[PDB]
Write a protein that binds this ligand. Structure first.
Ligand code: HEC
Ligand code: HEC
Ligand SMILES: CCCCCCCCCCCC1=C(O)C(=O)c2scnc2C1=O
Ligand SMILES: COC1=C(OC)C(=O)C(C/C=C(\C)CCC=C(C)C)=C(C)C1=O
Lengths: 111, 105, 75, 51, 378, 48, 61, 51
C-alpha cells in the first residue's frame, strides 16, 4: 500500500523540497561510489560499453541539476502511472495483494 | 476368488468413475467432509502427504473455477487411489470413542 | 471473520499470472466454449433431465385425463 | 446420533437435575396461568377467584 | 496506513465486501445471496414510494392503488416494479435454498437456521403485501391464512379473531396489516445482517464442498464485478416482467374489489404459495392438513440432522443428485397442482407429490447418501 | 384497464436496446478482471 | 487513424481520472439526446399511424 | 488553528493539485446540469436543446 501510494504521490504531487534531497542523495551516492581504482575502472569499462563514452562527473551534475519537482512528476508519471507492473513473490505470501488490486494501486482515482 | 465380488468391485468402480472427483485429479480422501475428527487427521498427516493433498485440492478448485476437467490420461485411476487419510481418521475416531466411554462411567 | 495471512498453510506451489491488459477477455470463446457446454450437459443430463420429463408426462397426462373425465358417452 | 449420552454417569447427572427441572415447569406454567388469567385452572384457587 | 482498514465503520465494510476471502471458485448459484439483498432494498424503495400514496382503509384501499397507477406520475412502474420485485424476491429465495441444499451449505447451522427464519419472515411479508390493495385474492388471502391458527387445539379460535380485529376479516384487519407489512422488512434487514455475521465467520462453501482455504480470492474486485453482472441480469428478468408482462405472475382476482360474500371459483394464492397450497388440501383433515403445511417448510430445520453422506456437496454424488432433481420437479408438480382445481386426477397426483416430497427429504435422500458411502468404502 | 400500455412498451424497447449494450459491456468488464485468474498456471515443486 | 486512435483517446482523455469522469459525463449528455431521439423514432416507425402524434392533423385547433 | 499549513511546500502542493481540482468541478457541475436538465444553461449547447 505504502510503496504504491508513494510512487503515486511522486507521480502527481512531488513537492519542490524533497527533490533537492533526492538530487543531493544522488550526488553523494555518485562521488562516493567512484572511490578508488576498482569502482572507477569498472565505471570506465562499463560506460564505454553502454554509452560509448565515459560521462564526466560534471555532466552528471548538470543532468542532476536540471531535475526539479515537475521533472519528477513528469518522468514518474511517464514510467509509473497506470502501468502494469511485474510482480515476483517468494515465501509466506498469502497476503500478497491480488494482481488486479496491485494494478489498481498503480493509479489514483482522485487524480 | 470370485465372479461376484469382482462385480461388487465393478459396481464400486462404476460409482467411482461416476462420482468424478478423479476428473479433477482428486482422490477420495480429498473429498471428505471436514469435521473435528477429519480436521485432526489432516493435522496428523506427514509433511509430504499434506503438501500433496493441498496441491490436489488447489488444482481441482482451479479447474472447478474454470469449469474444466483434466485430460482423461491425467484422471485418477480407481485402483491408483490411496486412502492416505483412512488410518489417521480411524485412529482419531478410535481415540474419541475411548474418551466417550470414559465419560460414561 | 477470517483474514488473508491467517487462512491455511501452503508450501511449494508456484502460481504464474498475467495482467488483463496483456491478454484476451474472450479467448477462443466459441472455439473452446461450445465444446465445453456440450461436455457439461452430457455430463449432467441423466441426473437433471429424467425427473422433469417424469413431471412432463404426468402433466400432459393429468391434463388429458381431467377434461376427458368431465364427459359421458352412453346414458 | 446420541449414543454417547447413555451411561451410568449420565443417569446420575439427570437424576441430579430432576428436582430442579420439576420446579422450572412449576415456575413456567403458574406464570402462564397468571399471565393469561386461566379461568379454567384459577377457579380452583381460594382467594384468587374474583368474579 | 490504509484508512479503509482501521476507521471503525469502514473496517466493517472492508471485512465484509472488500478484503473478505471468498473461494476462487463459487459459481452463479452464489449470486442469489446478493440478489436477495438487492431484492430487499428494491422492495424497500418502491414500497416506500408507494406508501406515500396508498391508504389502509377498506373503503378507499382499492381506489388508492388505482390512483397510483393512473394518476401518480410513474406510479405504475413504481407499483408493478414493487409487485414483480416480490415474485423476483421469491425466484431468488427458492434458488438460494436450492443451492443451499444441493451443495451442503446447511452444515453451517446458525447461518441456515437464520436463513430459515428469513424465509418465513419474507413469506409472511409478501402475504401481507398482496392483502393491501383489497382485491379478491387479498380478502380470502387474509381469511384462509389467518384461519390456519383455528386448527390449534382449544385456543386457535381466539387467536384467529385476535389478529383479525374481532369477529371476521374487516376494517381493523387492513390497517393492522399495512403496519405489519411496513415494519417486517426492516426486521428482515436486521436478521439478514445477523445471517451475514454468522456466514462471514466461516466464509462461503463452494461447488466442490472441499475447503477453499487453499485458494481464496479477495471479494473485490472479483465478486464485486461477478455480483454486478448478476445484479444486472436480475434487473433484466425484473424489467422484462414489468415492461412486457406485468400481470403474468399475479391473479386477475385481485383486480376485483373484495366481496366478503363471493370466494371465486378459480381461487388460489400467489404462485410462490402454490406448492404449499397443493400440500395442505391434499389432506381431508383440518388438523392434519395444516400440520402438513407447517412441516412443508419447518422441514428445512430438520435437513442438517438428516445429513448422512461422508461428503459435503452433491457435486460427486449422482444418486443424491438424482433424488435432488426429483425434489425440484416434484415441487414444480405441486406448484402446478396448486394451480388446478380440487377435481379428479389432480387430487390423487397431488396426494402423491405430497407423499413424495416428505419421502424424498425424510427417507429417500438419507438412504441414498448412505449407499454412496458404502459405494466409496466409507 | 391499462393507459400506461404504450408508454411501458416504449420504455421496454429502451430496456431491450439498453440491456443489449450493457450486458455485453458488463460481461466484458468481468471477463477482463477474471482474466488474471482464468489464465493462471499452477506448478507444484516439492522436494525429492 | 484506424489503429493509433484508442491510443489517442487514452492519452488525452482516459489517463486522468478527472478527464475520464469528465468524458463519461460529457459523453452521457450527448448519448441521452441521441438515444431518446433514435429510439423514440424507432418506436414511431413501428406504429406509423396508431398514435396521436400522427393523428394530430385530423382535429385542428 | 491552521498556521501549520502555510509554507513553501504547501503552496507547491496546492499548485500541484490545481488542474485536477479545476476539472473536478467541471465534472461535478456538468453532471448536475445534465441530471437536473438545467434549462438555463443547456439552451447554449448545440445539438442538446431538444425543445
Ligand atoms: C417481497 C416482500 C415485500 C417487501 C419486502 C415489501 N413489500 Fe410491499 N408488497 C409486497 C407485495 C406482494 C405487494 C402486493 C403487490 C400487488 O399485488 O399489488 C405489496 C404491496 C405494497 C403496497 C400497496 C401497493 C400495492 O402495490 O399493492 C404498499 C404501500 C407496500 N407494499 C409498502 C411496502 C413498504 C413500505 C415496504 C418496505 C417496508 C415494502 N412494501 C416491502 C411484498 C413486499
Ligand atoms: C433456508 C436457508 C436460507 C435462506 C432462506 C436464506 N439464506 Fe442466505 N444463506 C444461507 C446459507 C446456508 C448460505 C451459505 C452460502 C454458501 O456457503 O453456499 C447463505 C448465503 C447467503 C449470502 C452469501 C452469498 C451467497 O449466496 O453465498 C447472502 C448475502 C445471503 N445468504 C443473504 C440472504 C438473504 C438476503 C436472504 C433472504 C432474506 C437469505 N439469505 C435467505 C441460508 C439461507
Ligand atoms: C410465516 C408465516 C406464515 C404465512 C405464510 C403463508 C403460507 C402460504 C400458504 C397459502 C395459503 C392460502 C390458502 O390456503 C388459500 O386458500 C388462499 S385463497 C387466496 N389466498 C390463499 C392463500 O394464500
Ligand atoms: C462470499 O460471499 C458473499 C457474496 O458472494 C457470494 C456476496 O455477494 C455478498 C454481497 C452482499 C450484499 C450486496 C448485501 C446486501 C444485503 C443487505 C441486508 C444490505 C456477501 C456479503 C458475501 O459474504
Amino acid at each position: 500500500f505504502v510503496l504504491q501510494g508513494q510512487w503515486m504521490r511522486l507521480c502527481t504531487s512531488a513537492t519542490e523540497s524533497e527533490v533537492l534531497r533526492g538530487k543531493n542523495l544522488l550526488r553523494n551516492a555518485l562521488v562516493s561510489h567512484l572511490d578508488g581504482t576498482t569502482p572507477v575502472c569498472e565505471d570506465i569499462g562499463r560506460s564505454l560499453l553502454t554509452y560509448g563514452r565515459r560521462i564526466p562527473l560534471a555532466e552528471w551534475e548538470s543532468r542532476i541539476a536540471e531535475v526539479d519537482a515537475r521533472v519528477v512528476r513528469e518522468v514518474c508519471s511517464k514510467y509509473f502511472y497506470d502501468q502494469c507492473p511485474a510482480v515476483a513473490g517468494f515465501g509466506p505470501i498469502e497476503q500478497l495483494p491480488d494482481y488486479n488490486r496491485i494494478r489498481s494501486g498503480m493509479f489514483w482515482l482522485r487524480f | 476368488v470370485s465372479a461376484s465380488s469382482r462385480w461388487l468391485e465393478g459396481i464400486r468402480k462404476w460409482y467411482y468413475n461416476a462420482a468424478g472427483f478423479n476428473k479433477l485429479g482428486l482422490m477420495r480422501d480429498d473429498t471428505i467432509h471436514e469435521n473435528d475428527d477429519v480436521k485432526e487427521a489432516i493435522r496428523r498427516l506427514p509433511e509430504n502427504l499434506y503438501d500433496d493433498r493441498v496441491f490436489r485440492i488447489k488444482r481441482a478448485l482451479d479447474l472447478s473455477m474454470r469449469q474444466q476437467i483434466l485430460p482423461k490420461e491425467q484422471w485418477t485411476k480407481y485402483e491408483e487411489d490411496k486412502s492416505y487419510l483412512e488410518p489417521y481418521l480411524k485412529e482419531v475416531i478410535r481415540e474419541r470413542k475411548e474418551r466417550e466411554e470414559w465419560a460414561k462411567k | 471473520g477470517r483474514q488473508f495471512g491467517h487462512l491455511t498453510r501452503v508450501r511449494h506451489v508456484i502460481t504464474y499470472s498475467l495482467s488483463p491488459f496483456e491478454q484476451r477477455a474472450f479467448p477462443h470463446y466459441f472455439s473452446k466454449g461450445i465444446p465445453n457446454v456440450l461436455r457439461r450437459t452430457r455430463a449432467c443430463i441423466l441426473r437433471v433431465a429424467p425427473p422433469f420429463v417424469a413431471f412432463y408426462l404426468v402433466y400432459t397426462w393429468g391434463t388429458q385425463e381431467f377434461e376427458k373425465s368431465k364427459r359421458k358417452n352412453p346414458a | 446420533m446420541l449414543t454417547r449420552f447413555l451411561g451410568p454417569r449420565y443417569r446420575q447427572l439427570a437424576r441430579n437435575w430432576v428436582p430442579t427441572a420439576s420446579l422450572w415447569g412449576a415456575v413456567g406454567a403458574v406464570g402462564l396461568v397468571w399471565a393469561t388469567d386461566w379461568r379454567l385452572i384459577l377457579d380452583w384457587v381460594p382467594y384468587i377467584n374474583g368474579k | 496506513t490504509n484508512i479503509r482498514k482501521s476507521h471503525p465503520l469502514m473496517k466493517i465494510v472492508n471485512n465484509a465486501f472488500i478484503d473478505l476471502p471468498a473461494p476462487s471458485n463459487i459459481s452463479s448459484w452464489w449470486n442469489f445471496g446478493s440478489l436477495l439483498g438487492i431484492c430487499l432494498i428494491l422492495q424497500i424503495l418502491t414500497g416506500l414510494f408507494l406508501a406515500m400514496h396508498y391508504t389502509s382503509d377498506t373503503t378507499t384501499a382499492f381506489s388508492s392503488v388505482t390512483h397510483i397507477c393512473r394518476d401518480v406520475n410513474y406510479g405504475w412502474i413504481i407499483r408493478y416494479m414493487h409487485a414483480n420485485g416480490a415474485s423476483m424476491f421469491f425466484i431468488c429465495l427458492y434458488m438460494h435454498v436450492g443451492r443451499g441444499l444441493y451443495y451442503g451449505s446447511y452444515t453451517f447451522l446458525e447461518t441456515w437456521n437464520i436463513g430459515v427464519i428469513l424465509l418465513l419472515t419474507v413469506m409472511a411479508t409478501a402475504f401481507m403485501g398482496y392483502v393491501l390493495p383489497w382485491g379478491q385474492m387479498s380478502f380470502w388471502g387474509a381469511t384462509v391464512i389467518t384461519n390456519l391458527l383455528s386448527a390449534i387445539p382449544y385456543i386457535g379460535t381466539n387467536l384467529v379473531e385476535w389478529i383479525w380485529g374481532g369477529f371476521s376479516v374487516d376494517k381493523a384487519t387492513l390497517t393492522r396489516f399495512f403496519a405489519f407489512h411496513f415494519i417486517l422488512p426492516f426486521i428482515i434487514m436486521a436478521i439478514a445482517m445477523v445471517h451475514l455475521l454468522f456466514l462471514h465467520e466461516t466464509g462461503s462453501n463452494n461447488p466442490t464442498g472441499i475447503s477453499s482455504d487453499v485458494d481464496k480470492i479477495p471479494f473485490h474486485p472479483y465478486y464485486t464485478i461477478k455480483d454486478i453482472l448478476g445484479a444486472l441480469l436480475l434487473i433484466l428478468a425484473l424489467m422484462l416482467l414489468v415492461l412486457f408482462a406485468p400481470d403474468l405472475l399475479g391473479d386477475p382476482d385481485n383486480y376485483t374489489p373484495a366481496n366478503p360474500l363471493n370466494t371465486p371459483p378459480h381461487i388460489k394464492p400467489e404462485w410462490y404459495f402454490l406448492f404449499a397450497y397443493a400440500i395442505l388440501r391434499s389432506i381431508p383433515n383440518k388438523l392434519g392438513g395444516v400440520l402438513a403445511l407447517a412441516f412443508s417448510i419447518l422441514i428445512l430445520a430438520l435437513i442438517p440432522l438428516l445429513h448422512t453422506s461422508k461428503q459435503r456437496s452433491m457435486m460427486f454424488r449422482p444418486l443424491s443428485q438424482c433424488l435432488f432433481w426429483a425434489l425440484v420437479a416434484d415441487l414444480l408438480t405441486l406448484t402446478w397442482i396448486g394451480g388446478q382445481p380440487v377435481e379428479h386426477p389432480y387430487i390423487t397426483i397431488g396426494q402423491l407429490a405430497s407423499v413424495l416430497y416428505f419421502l424424498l427429504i425424510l427417507v429417500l435422500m438419507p438412504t441414498a447418501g448412505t449407499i454412496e458411502n458404502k459405494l466409496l468404502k466409507w | 384497464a391499462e393507459p400506461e400500455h404504450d408508454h411501458r412498451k416504449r420504455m421496454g424497447l429502451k430496456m431491450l436496446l439498453m440491456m443489449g449494450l450493457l450486458l455485453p459491456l458488463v460481461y466484458a468488464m468481468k471477463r477482463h478482471k477474471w482474466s488474471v485468474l482464468k489464465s493462471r498456471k499452477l506448478a507444484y515443486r516439492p522436494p525429492k | 487513424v484506424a489503429p493509433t486512435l484508442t491510443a489517442r483517446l487514452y492519452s488525452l482523455l482516459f489517463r486522468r481520472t478527472s478527464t475520464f469522469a469528465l468524458t463519461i459525463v460529457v459523453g452521457a449528455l450527448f448519448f441521452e439526446r441521441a438515444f431518446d431521439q433514435g429510439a423514440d423514432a424507432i418506436y414511431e416507425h413501428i406504429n406509423e399511424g396508431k398514435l396521436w402524434k400522427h393523428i394530430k392533423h385530423k382535429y385542428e385547433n
